[PDB]
Design a protein around this ligand. Sequence first.
Ligand code: SF4
Ligand code: SF4
Ligand code: SF4
Ligand code: SF4
Ligand code: SF4
Ligand code: SF4
Ligand code: FES
Ligand SMILES: [Ca+2]
Lengths: 145, 905, 145, 571
Amino acid sequence: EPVYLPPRYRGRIVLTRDPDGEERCVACNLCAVACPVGCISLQKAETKDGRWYPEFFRINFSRCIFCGLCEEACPTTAIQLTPDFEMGEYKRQDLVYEKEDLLISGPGKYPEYNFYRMAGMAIDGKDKGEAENEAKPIDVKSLLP
Amino acid sequence: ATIHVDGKEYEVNGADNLLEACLSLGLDIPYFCWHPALGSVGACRQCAVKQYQNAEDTRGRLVMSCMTPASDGTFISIDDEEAKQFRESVVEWLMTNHPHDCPVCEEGGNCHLQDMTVMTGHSFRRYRFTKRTHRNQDLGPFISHEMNRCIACYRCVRYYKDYAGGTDLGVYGAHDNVYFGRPEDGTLESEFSGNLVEICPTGVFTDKTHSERYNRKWDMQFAPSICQQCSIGCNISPGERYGELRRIENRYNGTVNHYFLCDRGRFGYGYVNLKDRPRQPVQRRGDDFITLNAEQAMQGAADILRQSKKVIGIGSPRASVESNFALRELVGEENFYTGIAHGEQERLQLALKVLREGGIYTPALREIESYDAVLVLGEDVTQTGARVALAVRQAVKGKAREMAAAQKVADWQIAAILNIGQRAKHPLFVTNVDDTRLDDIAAWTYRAPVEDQARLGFAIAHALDNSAPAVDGIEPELQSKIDVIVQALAGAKKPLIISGTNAGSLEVIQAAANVAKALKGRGADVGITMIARSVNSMGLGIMGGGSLEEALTELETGRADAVVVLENDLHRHASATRVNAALAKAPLVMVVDHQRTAIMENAHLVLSAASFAESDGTVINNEGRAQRFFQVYDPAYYDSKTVMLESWRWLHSLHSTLLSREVDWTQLDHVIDAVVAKIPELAGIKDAAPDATFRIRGQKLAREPHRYSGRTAMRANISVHEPRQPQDIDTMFTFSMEGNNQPTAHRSQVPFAWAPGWNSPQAWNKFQDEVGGKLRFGDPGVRLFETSENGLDYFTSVPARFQPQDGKWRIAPYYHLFGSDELSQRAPVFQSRMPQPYIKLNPADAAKLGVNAGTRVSFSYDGNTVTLPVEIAEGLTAGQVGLPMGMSGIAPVLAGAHLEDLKEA
Amino acid sequence: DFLTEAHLDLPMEFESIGKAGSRLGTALAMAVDHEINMVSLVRNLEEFFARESCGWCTPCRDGLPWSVKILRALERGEGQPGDIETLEQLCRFLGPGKTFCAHAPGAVEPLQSAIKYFREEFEAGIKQPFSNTHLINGIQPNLLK
Amino acid sequence: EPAWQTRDHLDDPVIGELRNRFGPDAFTVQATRTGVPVVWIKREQLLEVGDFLKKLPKPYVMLFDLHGMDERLRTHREGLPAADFSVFYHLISIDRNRDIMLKVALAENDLHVPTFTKLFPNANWYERETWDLFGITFDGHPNLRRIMMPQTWKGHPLRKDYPARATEFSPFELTKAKQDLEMEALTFKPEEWGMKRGTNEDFMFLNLGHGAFRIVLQLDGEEIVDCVPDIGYHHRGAEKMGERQSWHSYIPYTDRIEYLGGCVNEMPYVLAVEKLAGITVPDRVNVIRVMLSELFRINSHLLYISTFIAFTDRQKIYDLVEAITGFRMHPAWFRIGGVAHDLPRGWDRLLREFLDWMPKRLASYEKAALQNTILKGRSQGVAAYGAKEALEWGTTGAGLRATGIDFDVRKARPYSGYENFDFEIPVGGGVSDCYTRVMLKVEELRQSLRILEQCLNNMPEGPFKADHPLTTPPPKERTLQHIETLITHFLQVSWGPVMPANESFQMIEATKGINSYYLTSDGSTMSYRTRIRTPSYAHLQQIPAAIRGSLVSDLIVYLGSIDFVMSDVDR
Ligand code: SF4
Ligand code: SF4
Ligand code: SF4
Ligand code: SF4
Ligand code: SF4
Ligand code: SF4
Ligand code: FES
Ligand SMILES: [Ca+2]
């Protein structure tokens, strides 16, 4: 029979997407520095509109102890530990998961959060002042006192 | 003075404010608007302490520690509950409008606002309303602008305007909509605009070049290095990640470059990351290029060197002292030639003779800011030695400092000082072939050919002291301005004479020496500064050797049938046709270089040398200061087949393989001991930094921060097995975080500043004895020579005035901070900031030529006809033609040469 | 500072009004009738004082707009608990010596005097429960007591 | 005056007694957050002070701990004597219910201390480990050999100039170590182990194979004359990792010490970090931590009783812990200032189903234990010691209470709100054999189920993380919404939380005795020193003194009766 795993179960790690379908990871490297094993490695790239994303992203699962500190440290909820434990491999080199092996097609355990809806940095589709709890930019040449 | 902080008695300087005094004692007070170099203004209101009237006072009063003098019998409390509450409140008010941007902010992990938010203890938001937002500006290729993150602390405008003297950055608007930026979109014009990325305590101004390949500060591998982009030798912290050089941070040196770099040294590091660099030894066999490892490259090179009759070595002022000495040992002292031209070498050795025999003390870069009058002769200081231009600006503001000190206004109260000294400033007299960037604060600017600048210098020396040779034919108005200069220089307590080899005239240097000698004869506390051209120009001058012309003569006559070229492209010091013919005549050309130069097509062997990021070595300042630079990273850590060794390592092993037919990859301290044994005038470089056996209580010095990430994944795509940590036998530094970087450690080489609670560039306060002073156990570096007991004689070779002769055109050198240097102009981010190739002409000469502004003229130099578009220069003199030195096709050796057949294409 | 009808018998001097908790000022007194809501009046005063800030120093520049937004909320009946205490702390930490000049102490003098005398109108402005955070789906909030 | 306030404990009567006996200038009293009077003694007065404390009217009878510290890189050493190294001695008085920490300062060129093996015999292994890891010699020690590292080890790994990380592997040294392991029986020299009378010549030396470790046995036929247990085969360098992780990211390593414990091993570390941080946690945090520690204690006790004589009870506990934390064995779920998440919706259903199903299993276990005459003949009377033997060897937990000494940490020195729970402490007669220890563990299982019932029945409503600014990490919804919380989270998960410079200490009742974390902060984001006292170390050292004159099968039964794991021994 299939094994029952609770929703909090710390298993295989994925990178998730936002409700708009774009990857949540802003390549802020907080997961890599919070990893006590140091088995996360990534690099920041930027789109033409200024959106931060990971150029690559790799996890050494042969080193990973599945402690969940990266998911706890993620401020966009991109990286998540999912309830799945079937990860046995023939070669240890195949236990290094690149971004194509981690980026799922959905939001994972957090179905709605979008960090770029809260950030003040302007990306495509969110100009200045269009994020949450943000006023429109008042021009410094305005007539109003 | 005596202060009591929280009941603890401290002894401080009574001329300081309480913020700098308490930061010097290791006490933590949050602050934003104060800078050690910019002074106190009291804007941000963050540094509040509670002052009491006496010991038996309980109610107190909140005072601002940066605007309060640390007088005797002072009673303050930092850890008072009301003071702590108000500091948290100030952080909270700043946090009300701050964007939720830390994961997508380049300042994160390096942010002073992050540090002070954590330090005040504010982590709970009770503000529910909207945040103000701002549009961003385009500030050019180097600085990225994000006005949302601003906390309105006014540090940027205070630095850029009051300190750096720039004019295109300001504060606009009012109550809570204050905006810090340019009046319109465009490139920031100041040569010191890069220091905004460390002055700004938030992420408003960030390194765009680093933002292209961003990594957080804890992920960097840092090393203490010396900037290689001119002769001033500013201390830097280059930091790498994944095998490429990522950032140049400033490294504090209380003697040289304290808080600030220039834009060339900060943003022209990108030649290290070029993908066409030599990464492996390559031997030319027919048309084939065979890649070798280190051993067989050394064997083949040694066999070819042993079968040849004479081997000559052409060094460079780019290469370190150790590399040039290793080449000198490999080829022999009499066969070693400096890679610079004869005229450049003559000017360089005259500058060295003036420095270490003229009996006039040459100041450090920090000490330039205390001189009472400045005369700059021929040297475009802003474009060739830019940090000297910044220090000159501070020395010019010294007059307002003295006026404010006369009214008992404290030295940190910068607004009162700038108010008292409104436009009064110390006398500055610059000379150039055209306008400079110091003309805004210059008391006088002289635009003249180099002969006339030298004649003005000789006339100033003659008027100061009649024993100096007299100048005939001085016009009455020029004599009146010479008398103005003489009255300003004679009355100064501390005059400073700045010149250099970039003006292209021996007589300019002689005139500067004459003015300095005349001022010293009157008992004045005169100092002299010489600006060399490259990072190790004075080291190559001290080492000595023949000129490049002699080496080419040896190659052309056939007396030398093997040439080893070290870190030299040979086209910036000689004509390209002659160099190409001479190297094509030789049956062995071996180029030991780290950049793909044009002479590698003729080369029979190319040794992939290491740049300053991948190597250790010593370089000599323009003031004669020996400074060690350490390797940042191992080039072979990620690419296992990369054979990219130090130049001195290559040459020492080549010498060992020539002598005893075995390779010998030596250690750096062995080469340094060889230098200080064979060359006694370079014996100071032994004390530039301690040896590889130096330990802080038994442990090496760490190159990377203690929270370094990705240890078991940064190379996992190459192999899942973790390689051995790279071994550094050369230096006291380790290629890991298993080491010491404590601020209280007894060392002088600090790879990067970090303290617990201070993750920003404000962490340097912990590594200093007093804030804004020196490092706690002294600055790194050592002067090679002291001031001589006896001076020189007066140089009596006074040139005649410039005669504009028909057909000839005297090439006036124009220097650009972005473009004149070779390696930095190879960096791809500089092509946006580079000027277009424009040949400068007088309106009279261009009208005679029938040429307007913008049309392209063709001129032939050394049998090579090239075409450039004409820019009209009003400040130029007739018979001169302006050329940008160091650019594509225009060698800096053309400075002072004549031109033929300048006609419209 | 605002003064009441009991203070109307004081002689218009510096020392007498200083002992009453106010300043003589320009001695051009302004009379507030019973039809004028004190919260709207103090909102008008703080709006003036906030937009006439010079922007130099943090407490006035970034702590008068906070009081303005609180007073707009209390005027609209949208106040939340914490608002009157936030106004009092703004009055306390914008006093003499805390700001660069005396614009903000004089700014918050009417505010503290109105909270001292006519506290009922400010308290009647508070109608909503305190919340500055929306619910994030997969994360259980830390319920501070 | 909170519990975490820095105190000097000058009102302690031990300070007045030491001052009246040795003079006021004989020692230096240090203010710490250890909760203990810390006094610095001259090295030449150390045995005198130890003998004076051994003979007080309510004497200090147990040496709880003894180890070293490298003070060379410690910058915030204000009010402390000049030391390059130091040796600390934690001594516990049970009648007084107090404890003291003596500290001896040592220069780098003179690293030797007089030995305590004439006062406290557990100082044998403590001083051997201090020599092995710091290089400090103890003069008069019977056999000062390495205990953690192999005898052919270069350097002392807990020194500050010794690199923490793993060096390059070599098949060269591997095949040397293999070839000396093959020739060890041929070249066994019985004074490289502390033995004597080696081949009488009737005596035979063997090696024996809860973790894997060797014990050298000296036999008169089938009787044990002497034995030395060879440990260090499970040494992970956890204390060195304490010096190389941030305060937050060291928590999984605290889990992997005493791997059957989980949250029980998590608890004293976060309690000592919160003492360093000046954090008082709310009641919901206290009850969550107590509940998880009691669940894991029940799991460990069930495994111990099943081993000594099952799978369903531990499976139910593992599903409950997996639902709460996301993991069974090493939850990594306690945080500085609170817990990682809130309790999931449905935790109470699982706990109620576990508590309604457990008492019949407990009745079955009591039937299988106290009514098993074969077990009651095999177990009692063998490897038995009294109170005096247990005190002098640092025995804690079930053995100490089985000697009749009523000392539990949860009652004598309460932590995490254990005084709010009504539970009993089982104490036996005067004899600590296998049988009495097993029945004490059964009674503690019953009491832990009582504590779990009280955790379920009145569970507080409130926060699962403290309001303190040093709570690592801050609550995740405020982190994802508020910029100052995002800043605090950013700097607390990257550089790490900054604990101000102090020394803290927390002892708890672990599943196998008293586990303590002694943390020294140098004001940085990592621990300057992490000292972990584990009970399996002190229990394993008592093995030679308890089976002098028993048989090898009796030694096997004694090994089964002691609750220990090798990760706890070696850490
Ligand atoms: S679960 Fe833990 S060990 Fe694994 S990648 Fe995340 S932080 Fe690293
Ligand atoms: S912490 Fe999250 S957003 Fe940041 S780099 Fe890691 S996965 Fe990406
Ligand atoms: S400036 Fe500092 S506090 Fe603001 S978003 Fe950037 S890292 Fe965060
Ligand atoms: S842009 Fe930076 S330096 Fe300038 S006022 Fe704003 S926070 Fe300060
Ligand atoms: S002044 Fe010269 S040495 Fe200094 S940063 Fe600029 S280029 Fe480098
Ligand atoms: S209190 Fe004065 S100095 Fe401060 S911002 Fe307001 S108007 Fe300017
Ligand atoms: S640092 Fe003193 S008020 Fe800004
Ligand atoms: Ca090296």
